[PDB]
Amino acid sequence: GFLQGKKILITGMISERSIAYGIAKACREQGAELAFTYVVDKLEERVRKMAAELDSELVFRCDVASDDEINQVFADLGKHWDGLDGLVHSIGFAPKEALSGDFLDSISREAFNTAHEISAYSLPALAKAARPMMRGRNSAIVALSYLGAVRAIPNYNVMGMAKASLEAGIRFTAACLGKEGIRCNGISAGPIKDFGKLLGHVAAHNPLRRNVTIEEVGNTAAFLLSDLSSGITGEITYVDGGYSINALST
Amino acid sequence: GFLQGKKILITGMISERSIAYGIAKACREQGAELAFTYVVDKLEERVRKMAAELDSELVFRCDVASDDEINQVFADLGKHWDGLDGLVHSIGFAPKEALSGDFLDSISREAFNTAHEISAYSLPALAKAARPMMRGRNSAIVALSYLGAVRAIPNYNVMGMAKASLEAGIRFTAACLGKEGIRCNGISAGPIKFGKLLGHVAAHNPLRRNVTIEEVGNTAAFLLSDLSSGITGEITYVDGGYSINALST
Amino acid sequence: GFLQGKKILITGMISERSIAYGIAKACREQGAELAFTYVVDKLEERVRKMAAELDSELVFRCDVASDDEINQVFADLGKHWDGLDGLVHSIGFAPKEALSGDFLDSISREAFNTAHEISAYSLPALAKAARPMMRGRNSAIVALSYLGAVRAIPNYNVMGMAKASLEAGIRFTAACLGKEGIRCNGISAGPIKDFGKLLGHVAAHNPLRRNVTIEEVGNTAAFLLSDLSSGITGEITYVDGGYSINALST
Amino acid sequence: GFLQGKKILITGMISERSIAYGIAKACREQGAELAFTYVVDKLEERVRKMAAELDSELVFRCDVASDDEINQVFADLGKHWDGLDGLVHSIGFAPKEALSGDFLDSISREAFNTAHEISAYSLPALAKAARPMMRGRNSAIVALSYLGAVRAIPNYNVMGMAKASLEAGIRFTAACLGKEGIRCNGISAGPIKFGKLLGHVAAHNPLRRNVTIEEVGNTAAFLLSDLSSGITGEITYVDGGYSINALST
């Protein structure tokens, strides 16, 4: 496996359906050692269980709304690990009411603020807090994005703005940390397990004529966290079966 | 002129150096009737003076931090105008400390929040509040962005994230309002009066010079006019070709 | 009109349906003085008639396959005009058999060569030949492109490759001539008068919920040929009613 | 390795400095079985030697100017291999005179034609000829591009137009073959050993250094493997972040 010796912290793993689980599993299959965060105490047990199946006992509470908690994760993790080789940002949130229907009717100041703070600011906040552990290690950050960053799409609404902010954050973080040997890249993932019809629309219209899997996203993340991708930084890689590059599909 | 009789509300005109002034002047030259906002009471007199030179007595306070104030503008403006044909978003802010040096060292939660709220959320907030006045008129919104949206650049830092959010907001607003006959477009302007930034751009862009507020202004006038009726959700680069050049030693 | 005093050469005007006619008409309405090319002698009369309705007697044969003919246009035009303020490239060709069905089955070396030579090389060839007349005049070139340059689309096939070549040509030409006061920009136009269903697909899916007109393309060209756009060069402007920036339209 | 048993044809390997060599080596390290093309008979021996060090005796003449030769490669290769899992396009050419100085002064019809035919048409020509061998295998094509496709750069000139054509060819090929289980992707590589170009990039990119053929090679190996099965029509930048940086004085 090409992540032998790599130590990787993974956010956003709330179930076996989650993108972060696909990433965790892919990384574990390539020999990485893993650690995880959970946002709320209700999920702790479930996350510890998933971690254990992935050979990890390293699980930490981290509400990315809190600078203290973010920093505490790395202080606690640093007791176990000499350094951090990988960091996976797979977290986003916006109030449900802002994520459907008319873009302007559904948006509000509060939903905007929340969406950007949790979904976009969290990337540089985590990179900043991880920086002492990651610098000088030829390490890597991967963050998950979505086509709403760069295209107007139905129902994504304010999250589109937040993902665009995130994607810029990826570029700025990469430009910031490259000299210290830390890479930062994104994956714009296609939709995964109107939602049934979204999936159908994509599978009918993309070059691969199917939806992508968490394994496909996971393996791309594993590559971007590995030294195999050492020439790549500030990149958004589309794992959508070619969807974004197709047009005029009647 | 090609904006003859068009009624246009312009934000961000704080001086004759401002991008918004260049836009105002360009629109006035094409026959538009103008109205303006000012952020703080200290600027009222100065903005009323500029408005008057552009043949306008329509000036309103609007701190885009305030939903009350945003909506009040359109209530007050609607007493004078039956409808609104144009809306110009030319406002942005981030704490000065967040806009130089190392990106991660200079960033903070508060500066991030402020930068996005004032610089990005303000576009959909203004479009939303203007919607009753603008819909059904084949009207137009124009917002100002910057290269930091789509490239990592030194010293722009968190504003880059905020402009990227804005540019997505332009796309989503355009997709939202197109059916009601409202367009929404952006201009990514090159730098305009840091001395070395300007010099770097003038040495490296195809035109070998910096762009002017007149050039940004005329592009805005075009994007506010019916001449651009086939264009929406677009970011147009008025940077003398800077963004499309590379590997210039 | 904002093209007062401007002298503009327009290629590709073969009928009143053509994009170039929309451009000619738009430019004439803003006060430009026009000249035109025609590729084959069969069209001469028809083009002279259209020119005359647009107040022009300046019509020249120009097969862009021929360097001699390209150069001759500017030698002949230079007898009438002190300089050239505008140049509109609205020409493209590929063999019909290469423009439908499966991309690889339909492509051939010969069709590729022809498509690129006529549709892409013609831009720098025309800019080069026009350069003595255009330099120092604060003049402008506009070329027409299509979404196939930057997205995979059905049926456009090799023309997509040719348009991508063209769009790069626009950038390189702009970078080349900017110092001499010549701008070069593109318009990526949406479809205009499976073709009936293409038009329907676009009108159902773009932000404006309709197809664009030759007037809308024409007015954008007029702007890009005018001094109002003096800050803009190397740009591709999408006149497609927002189509290219939308996605996941179910 | 993650290409274990994969059978991959590689073009453009003319020396150990070549991008294609970096790709070959990276693929061999992941367990791929390799075959190679050479453009001219003068290079045959040198290419056979390199192939042998990479455990291959499968080497074929292929001047991509020739449809006969392109198709012959696959007829000859098909005698040894039941099918083809990977195809690497790492070839490009334009007359030297067209690749420096003023873009319009340096360009010509002939140089344009040659550059596009050899550098761009060769991708769909090779994909087409390989299609019977590749279809139904969950196989992959990778092609090499350069920033000149999407930015105006000094000295690349007409090759920029040719690479843009290539990148569109990658998209169209991907859209064409995806249903048959063949992917097609590109790598836009940073410069690799002009001395000042390399210096400019190393001073300006996020990584503050030039990329290596190993880095390009490993990315190609990934894009040729099933690990990348969700990715097609993509251009991946292996340039140490160069293309995403701007305004660096």
Side-chain angles (χ1 to χ4, degrees), chain B residues 154-186:
Chain B
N155 303 141
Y156 209 54
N157 293 359
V158 70
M159 270 304 290
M161 294 178 83
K163 291 301 198 180
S165 180
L166 176 68
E167 292 193 5
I170 287 167
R171 289 185 286 275
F172 273 92
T173 300
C176 181
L177 300 178
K179 199 176 177 67
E180 283 154 83
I182 310 166
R183 294 177 303 101
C184 187
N185 290 296

Short mmCIF file of all heavy atoms in Angstrom, two decimals, chain B residues 154-186:
data_model
loop_
_atom_site.label_atom_id
_atom_site.label_comp_id
_atom_site.label_asym_id
_atom_site.label_seq_id
_atom_site.Cartn_x
_atom_site.Cartn_y
_atom_site.Cartn_z
N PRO B 154 -0.78 36.83 -3.23
CA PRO B 154 -0.27 37.35 -1.97
C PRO B 154 -1.13 38.51 -1.47
O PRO B 154 -1.68 39.29 -2.25
CB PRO B 154 1.15 37.82 -2.32
CG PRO B 154 1.15 38.05 -3.79
CD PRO B 154 0.05 37.23 -4.39
N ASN B 155 -1.30 38.55 -0.16
CA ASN B 155 -1.89 39.68 0.57
C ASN B 155 -3.42 39.82 0.47
O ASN B 155 -4.00 40.54 1.27
CB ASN B 155 -1.19 41.00 0.20
CG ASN B 155 0.31 40.97 0.46
OD1 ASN B 155 1.09 41.51 -0.32
ND2 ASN B 155 0.73 40.32 1.55
N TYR B 156 -4.07 39.15 -0.47
CA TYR B 156 -5.52 39.23 -0.55
C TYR B 156 -6.13 38.32 0.52
O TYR B 156 -7.13 38.67 1.13
CB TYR B 156 -6.02 38.84 -1.93
CG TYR B 156 -7.31 39.51 -2.31
CD1 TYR B 156 -7.42 40.90 -2.26
CD2 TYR B 156 -8.41 38.77 -2.72
CE1 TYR B 156 -8.59 41.53 -2.62
CE2 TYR B 156 -9.59 39.40 -3.07
CZ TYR B 156 -9.68 40.77 -3.03
OH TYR B 156 -10.86 41.36 -3.38
N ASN B 157 -5.50 37.17 0.72
CA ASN B 157 -5.81 36.27 1.83
C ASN B 157 -7.32 35.95 1.91
O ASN B 157 -7.90 35.47 0.93
CB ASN B 157 -5.21 36.81 3.14
CG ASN B 157 -3.69 36.78 3.13
OD1 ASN B 157 -3.07 36.34 2.16
ND2 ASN B 157 -3.08 37.25 4.21
N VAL B 158 -7.95 36.24 3.04
CA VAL B 158 -9.32 35.81 3.27
C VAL B 158 -10.31 36.48 2.29
O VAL B 158 -11.36 35.91 2.00
CB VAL B 158 -9.76 36.03 4.73
CG1 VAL B 158 -9.90 37.51 5.05
CG2 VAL B 158 -11.04 35.27 5.02
N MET B 159 -9.96 37.66 1.77
CA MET B 159 -10.82 38.31 0.77
C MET B 159 -10.97 37.46 -0.49
O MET B 159 -11.98 37.57 -1.18
CB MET B 159 -10.30 39.70 0.37
CG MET B 159 -10.82 40.84 1.21
SD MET B 159 -12.62 41.01 1.33
CE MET B 159 -13.02 41.52 -0.33
N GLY B 160 -9.98 36.64 -0.77
CA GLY B 160 -10.04 35.71 -1.90
C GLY B 160 -11.17 34.71 -1.73
O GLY B 160 -11.93 34.46 -2.67
N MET B 161 -11.28 34.17 -0.53
CA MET B 161 -12.38 33.28 -0.19
C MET B 161 -13.72 33.99 -0.30
O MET B 161 -14.67 33.44 -0.83
CB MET B 161 -12.19 32.70 1.21
CG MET B 161 -10.99 31.77 1.31
SD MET B 161 -10.79 31.16 2.99
CE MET B 161 -11.95 29.80 3.00
N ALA B 162 -13.77 35.24 0.18
CA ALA B 162 -15.00 36.02 0.12
C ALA B 162 -15.41 36.35 -1.33
O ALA B 162 -16.58 36.25 -1.66
CB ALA B 162 -14.87 37.29 0.94
N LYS B 163 -14.44 36.68 -2.18
CA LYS B 163 -14.75 36.95 -3.60
C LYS B 163 -15.20 35.70 -4.36
O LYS B 163 -16.03 35.80 -5.25
CB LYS B 163 -13.57 37.57 -4.33
CG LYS B 163 -13.24 38.99 -3.90
CD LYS B 163 -14.41 39.94 -4.11
CE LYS B 163 -13.96 41.40 -4.10
NZ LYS B 163 -15.09 42.36 -4.30
N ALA B 164 -14.62 34.55 -4.02
CA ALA B 164 -15.06 33.28 -4.61
C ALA B 164 -16.52 33.02 -4.25
O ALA B 164 -17.32 32.64 -5.11
CB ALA B 164 -14.18 32.13 -4.14
N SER B 165 -16.86 33.23 -2.99
CA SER B 165 -18.24 33.16 -2.52
C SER B 165 -19.14 34.11 -3.31
O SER B 165 -20.22 33.72 -3.78
CB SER B 165 -18.31 33.50 -1.04
OG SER B 165 -19.64 33.45 -0.54
N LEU B 166 -18.68 35.35 -3.48
CA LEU B 166 -19.40 36.34 -4.28
C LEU B 166 -19.66 35.86 -5.71
O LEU B 166 -20.77 35.97 -6.22
CB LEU B 166 -18.64 37.67 -4.34
CG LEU B 166 -19.24 38.78 -5.22
CD1 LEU B 166 -20.55 39.28 -4.63
CD2 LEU B 166 -18.25 39.92 -5.35
N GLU B 167 -18.61 35.36 -6.36
CA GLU B 167 -18.75 34.93 -7.76
C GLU B 167 -19.75 33.78 -7.89
O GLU B 167 -20.52 33.76 -8.84
CB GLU B 167 -17.38 34.58 -8.37
CG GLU B 167 -16.51 35.82 -8.53
CD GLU B 167 -15.28 35.64 -9.40
OE1 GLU B 167 -15.09 34.57 -10.02
OE2 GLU B 167 -14.49 36.61 -9.45
N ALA B 168 -19.75 32.85 -6.95
CA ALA B 168 -20.79 31.82 -6.90
C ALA B 168 -22.17 32.45 -6.69
O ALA B 168 -23.14 32.04 -7.33
CB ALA B 168 -20.50 30.81 -5.80
N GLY B 169 -22.23 33.44 -5.80
CA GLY B 169 -23.46 34.21 -5.57
C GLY B 169 -23.99 34.86 -6.83
O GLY B 169 -25.21 34.95 -7.05
N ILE B 170 -23.08 35.31 -7.69
CA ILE B 170 -23.47 35.89 -8.96
C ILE B 170 -24.14 34.85 -9.85
O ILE B 170 -25.18 35.10 -10.45
CB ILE B 170 -22.26 36.53 -9.68
CG1 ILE B 170 -21.88 37.83 -8.96
CG2 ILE B 170 -22.58 36.80 -11.14
CD1 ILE B 170 -20.53 38.39 -9.36
N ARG B 171 -23.54 33.67 -9.92
CA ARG B 171 -24.09 32.58 -10.70
C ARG B 171 -25.45 32.14 -10.18
O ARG B 171 -26.39 31.98 -10.95
CB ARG B 171 -23.13 31.40 -10.72
CG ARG B 171 -21.89 31.67 -11.57
CD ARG B 171 -21.01 30.44 -11.68
NE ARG B 171 -20.27 30.15 -10.45
CZ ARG B 171 -19.10 30.71 -10.12
NH1 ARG B 171 -18.53 31.62 -10.90
NH2 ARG B 171 -18.51 30.36 -8.99
N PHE B 172 -25.55 31.95 -8.88
CA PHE B 172 -26.79 31.49 -8.27
C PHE B 172 -27.89 32.53 -8.39
O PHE B 172 -29.04 32.20 -8.65
CB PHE B 172 -26.57 31.10 -6.80
CG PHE B 172 -26.12 29.68 -6.62
CD1 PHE B 172 -24.76 29.37 -6.56
CD2 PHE B 172 -27.04 28.64 -6.53
CE1 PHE B 172 -24.34 28.05 -6.40
CE2 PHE B 172 -26.63 27.32 -6.36
CZ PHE B 172 -25.26 27.03 -6.30
N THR B 173 -27.53 33.80 -8.22
CA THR B 173 -28.49 34.88 -8.38
C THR B 173 -28.99 34.91 -9.83
O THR B 173 -30.19 35.01 -10.07
CB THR B 173 -27.88 36.22 -7.98
OG1 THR B 173 -27.47 36.15 -6.61
CG2 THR B 173 -28.87 37.35 -8.13
N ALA B 174 -28.07 34.78 -10.78
CA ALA B 174 -28.45 34.77 -12.20
C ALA B 174 -29.41 33.63 -12.51
O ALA B 174 -30.43 33.82 -13.18
CB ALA B 174 -27.21 34.69 -13.08
N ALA B 175 -29.10 32.44 -12.02
CA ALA B 175 -29.94 31.26 -12.24
C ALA B 175 -31.29 31.46 -11.56
O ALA B 175 -32.31 31.00 -12.06
CB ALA B 175 -29.26 30.01 -11.72
N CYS B 176 -31.29 32.15 -10.43
CA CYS B 176 -32.50 32.41 -9.66
C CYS B 176 -33.44 33.36 -10.38
O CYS B 176 -34.63 33.09 -10.49
CB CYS B 176 -32.15 32.97 -8.28
SG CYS B 176 -33.57 33.32 -7.21
N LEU B 177 -32.91 34.47 -10.88
CA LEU B 177 -33.74 35.57 -11.34
C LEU B 177 -33.95 35.68 -12.84
O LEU B 177 -34.72 36.53 -13.29
CB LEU B 177 -33.15 36.88 -10.85
CG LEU B 177 -33.02 37.03 -9.35
CD1 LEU B 177 -32.37 38.37 -9.08
CD2 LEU B 177 -34.39 36.96 -8.68
N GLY B 178 -33.27 34.84 -13.61
CA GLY B 178 -33.32 34.94 -15.06
C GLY B 178 -34.73 34.83 -15.61
O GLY B 178 -35.13 35.59 -16.49
N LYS B 179 -35.50 33.91 -15.04
CA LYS B 179 -36.87 33.69 -15.48
C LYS B 179 -37.76 34.93 -15.27
O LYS B 179 -38.67 35.18 -16.05
CB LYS B 179 -37.46 32.47 -14.77
CG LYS B 179 -38.67 31.88 -15.45
CD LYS B 179 -39.11 30.61 -14.72
CE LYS B 179 -40.37 30.00 -15.33
NZ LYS B 179 -40.14 29.46 -16.70
N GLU B 180 -37.48 35.71 -14.23
CA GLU B 180 -38.18 37.00 -13.98
C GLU B 180 -37.63 38.18 -14.75
O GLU B 180 -38.03 39.32 -14.50
CB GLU B 180 -38.05 37.38 -12.51
CG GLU B 180 -38.96 36.62 -11.60
CD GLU B 180 -38.37 36.57 -10.20
OE1 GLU B 180 -38.54 37.53 -9.44
OE2 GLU B 180 -37.71 35.58 -9.90
N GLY B 181 -36.68 37.94 -15.65
CA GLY B 181 -36.13 39.01 -16.46
C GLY B 181 -35.11 39.88 -15.74
O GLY B 181 -34.97 41.05 -16.04
N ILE B 182 -34.38 39.30 -14.79
CA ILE B 182 -33.29 40.02 -14.13
C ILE B 182 -31.99 39.27 -14.38
O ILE B 182 -31.89 38.08 -14.09
CB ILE B 182 -33.50 40.17 -12.61
CG1 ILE B 182 -34.89 40.72 -12.29
CG2 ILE B 182 -32.41 41.07 -12.00
CD1 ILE B 182 -35.26 40.57 -10.82
N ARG B 183 -30.98 39.98 -14.88
CA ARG B 183 -29.65 39.42 -15.10
C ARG B 183 -28.73 39.79 -13.94
O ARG B 183 -28.96 40.78 -13.23
CB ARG B 183 -29.09 39.88 -16.45
CG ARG B 183 -29.89 39.31 -17.61
CD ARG B 183 -29.44 39.77 -19.00
NE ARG B 183 -29.47 41.22 -19.12
CZ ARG B 183 -28.40 42.01 -19.04
NH1 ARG B 183 -27.18 41.52 -18.85
NH2 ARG B 183 -28.57 43.33 -19.17
N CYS B 184 -27.71 38.96 -13.72
CA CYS B 184 -26.71 39.21 -12.70
C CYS B 184 -25.35 38.79 -13.22
O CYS B 184 -25.13 37.62 -13.55
CB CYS B 184 -27.03 38.47 -11.41
SG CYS B 184 -25.93 38.90 -10.03
N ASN B 185 -24.44 39.75 -13.27
CA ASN B 185 -23.11 39.53 -13.82
C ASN B 185 -22.05 40.17 -12.95
O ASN B 185 -22.32 41.06 -12.16
CB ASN B 185 -23.03 40.12 -15.22
CG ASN B 185 -23.85 39.36 -16.23
OD1 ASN B 185 -23.57 38.20 -16.52
ND2 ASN B 185 -24.85 40.03 -16.80
N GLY B 186 -20.82 39.71 -13.12
CA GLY B 186 -19.71 40.27 -12.41
C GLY B 186 -18.65 40.86 -13.32
O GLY B 186 -18.56 40.52 -14.50
#
